[PDB]
Design an enzyme around this catalytic site. Sequence first.
Site, PDB file in Angstrom:
ATOM      1  N   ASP A 220     -51.343  20.743 -11.263  1.00 22.71           N
ATOM      2  CA  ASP A 220     -49.976  20.345 -11.587  1.00 22.71           C
ATOM      3  C   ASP A 220     -49.100  21.588 -11.670  1.00 22.71           C
ATOM      4  O   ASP A 220     -48.219  21.675 -12.529  1.00 22.71           O
ATOM      5  CB  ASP A 220     -49.981  19.573 -12.908  1.00 22.71           C
TER       6      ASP A 220
ATOM      7  N   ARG B 211     -41.672  23.364 -13.559  1.00 24.11           N
ATOM      8  CA  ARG B 211     -41.482  22.718 -14.872  1.00 24.11           C
ATOM      9  C   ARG B 211     -42.641  23.038 -15.814  1.00 24.11           C
ATOM     10  O   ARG B 211     -42.494  22.807 -17.002  1.00 24.11           O
ATOM     11  CB  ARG B 211     -41.358  21.198 -14.729  1.00 24.11           C
ATOM     12  N   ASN B 212     -43.764  23.484 -15.247  1.00 24.99           N
ATOM     13  CA  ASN B 212     -44.937  23.808 -16.033  1.00 24.99           C
ATOM     14  C   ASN B 212     -45.119  25.315 -16.201  1.00 24.99           C
ATOM     15  O   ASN B 212     -46.222  25.762 -16.490  1.00 24.99           O
ATOM     16  CB  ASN B 212     -46.153  23.125 -15.389  1.00 24.99           C
TER      17      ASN B 212
ATOM     18  N   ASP C 292     -49.276  24.070 -19.533  1.00 24.89           N
ATOM     19  CA  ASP C 292     -49.669  22.721 -19.189  1.00 24.89           C
ATOM     20  C   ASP C 292     -51.102  22.695 -18.689  1.00 24.89           C
ATOM     21  O   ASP C 292     -51.357  22.600 -17.491  1.00 24.89           O
ATOM     22  CB  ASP C 292     -48.578  22.091 -18.322  1.00 24.89           C
TER      23      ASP C 292
HETATM   24  C1  LIG Z   1     -39.000  26.360 -25.034  1.00 24.75           C
HETATM   25  N1  LIG Z   1     -40.049  27.341 -25.227  1.00 24.75           N
HETATM   26  C2  LIG Z   1     -41.345  27.015 -25.288  1.00 24.75           C
HETATM   27  N2  LIG Z   1     -42.198  28.000 -25.599  1.00 24.75           N
HETATM   28  C3  LIG Z   1     -43.493  27.659 -25.674  1.00 24.75           C
HETATM   29  C4  LIG Z   1     -43.956  26.361 -25.428  1.00 24.75           C
HETATM   30  C5  LIG Z   1     -45.303  25.925 -25.506  1.00 24.75           C
HETATM   31  C6  LIG Z   1     -45.662  24.634 -25.284  1.00 24.75           C
HETATM   32  C7  LIG Z   1     -47.072  24.204 -25.348  1.00 24.75           C
HETATM   33  C8  LIG Z   1     -47.823  24.069 -24.176  1.00 24.75           C
HETATM   34  C9  LIG Z   1     -49.144  23.685 -24.261  1.00 24.75           C
HETATM   35  C10 LIG Z   1     -49.726  23.412 -25.477  1.00 24.75           C
HETATM   36  C11 LIG Z   1     -48.996  23.505 -26.641  1.00 24.75           C
HETATM   37  C12 LIG Z   1     -47.689  23.918 -26.570  1.00 24.75           C
HETATM   38 CL1  LIG Z   1     -46.822  24.002 -28.051  1.00 24.75          CL
HETATM   39  C13 LIG Z   1     -44.632  23.609 -24.966  1.00 24.75           C
HETATM   40  O1  LIG Z   1     -44.886  22.412 -24.773  1.00 24.75           O
HETATM   41  N3  LIG Z   1     -43.312  24.062 -24.920  1.00 24.75           N
HETATM   42  C14 LIG Z   1     -42.277  23.052 -24.659  1.00 24.75           C
HETATM   43  C15 LIG Z   1     -41.744  23.051 -23.244  1.00 24.75           C
HETATM   44  C16 LIG Z   1     -42.824  22.879 -22.215  1.00 24.75           C
HETATM   45  C17 LIG Z   1     -42.292  22.362 -20.894  1.00 24.75           C
HETATM   46  N4  LIG Z   1     -43.324  22.426 -19.795  1.00 24.75           N
HETATM   47  C18 LIG Z   1     -42.953  25.407 -25.118  1.00 24.75           C
HETATM   48  N5  LIG Z   1     -41.655  25.726 -25.050  1.00 24.75           N
END
Ligand SMILES: CNc1ncc2cc(-c3ccccc3Cl)c(=O)n(CCCCN)c2n1
Length: 264
Positions: free
Chosen positions: A125, A129-130, A143
């Site tokens: 994936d 966006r990831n 992701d």
């Molecule tokens: C905005 N800065 C920001 N910084 C760090 C992260 C880390 C995660 C995350 C990813 C995997 C497991 C766990 C986590 Cl917490 C996450 O979901 N977001 C949200 C956006 C992701 C979009 N694709 C993050 N956003």
Amino acid sequence: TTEIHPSCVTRQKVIGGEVYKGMLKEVPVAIKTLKAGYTEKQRVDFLGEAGIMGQFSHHNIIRLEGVISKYKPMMIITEYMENGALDKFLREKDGEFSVLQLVGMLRGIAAGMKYLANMNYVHRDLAARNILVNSNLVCKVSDFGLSRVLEDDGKIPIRWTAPEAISYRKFTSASDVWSFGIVMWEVMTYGERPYWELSNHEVMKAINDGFRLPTPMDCPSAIYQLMMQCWQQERARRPKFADIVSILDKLIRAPDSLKTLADF
Ligand SMILES: CNc1ncc2cc(-c3ccccc3Cl)c(=O)n(CCCCN)c2n1
């Protein structure tokens, strides 16, 4: 993985259960939660993502701080990436970087992907966006969600996916290279949507008939050649991530090489 005590974490703002920006005691973190009544599969998938992330240690792969698993709601705590998702970031910053900066973003992504591939991990994936972006413009693959299904067959979008992955469910690092070529095009166009308004069936028919995405505006010839090679129908003719990192590094170290533009 590090088990973190809930008293060391404060959630501040929802940025994506939910995902929050918060603080870890202080350092900013992102915090993903799992809601009450989750199933066994949900739990394995949720903690599975953290388990995968914990096996990796690379500049271009999001860093896991730890997990809350002994207390509910369960959480995954990662580093906070100040500029968020790459696709949205590019679209909000259209035209604001140098070609060299854009190419350096791609080298980072490619280095992360080479590491995942060599660690025997197929992402399936890969897309802008990831990818997440920090305040040093460092791009990191994110992701590692376990439960992903292909669109029409999280949904993995058709138009980022290699032909063999669509046609016979063969996902490999070579299919990730195809996806990387799409990410190259996303970056060099500042977040344009691949294939515009073509339907999924129109994209698949176009690809099978030999069409490929056209050159981005103001795109270095070398960069367009590389993304084109990522989209070879035959997997064996695609570069490996090793090759991509090598080529991008050569271009960056001799940056005048990027002044030669593909015809738009
Ligand atoms: C905005 N800065 C920001 N910084 C760090 C992260 C880390 C995660 C995350 C990813 C995997 C497991 C766990 C986590 Cl917490 C996450 O979901 N977001 C949200 C956006 C992701 C979009 N694709 C993050 N956003």
